[PDB]
Design a protein around this ligand. Structure first.
Ligand code: CL
Ligand code: CL
Ligand code: CL
Length: 56
């Protein structure tokens, strides 16, 4: 529903290269990260716009 915004940043154990956005609780800003390709959670957005639309 949108408790996804409060889930922590999760890179996962995989070593792939997937640039994504998570909403950072501390800063209040949608922040880039390299997601590994497996085992992520809900705080993982494909675009900056998507993250801001949902979380802000
Ligand atoms: Cl992690
Ligand atoms: Cl294992
Ligand atoms: Cl935007």
């Amino acid at each position: 529903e949108a408790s996804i915004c409060s889930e922590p940043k999760k890179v996962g154990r995989c070593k792939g290269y997937f640039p994504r956005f998570y909403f950072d609780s501390e800063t209040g800003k949608c922040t880039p990260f390299i997601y590994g390709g497996c085992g992520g959670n809900g705080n993982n957005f494909e675009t900056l716009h998507q993250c801001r639309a949902i979380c802000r």
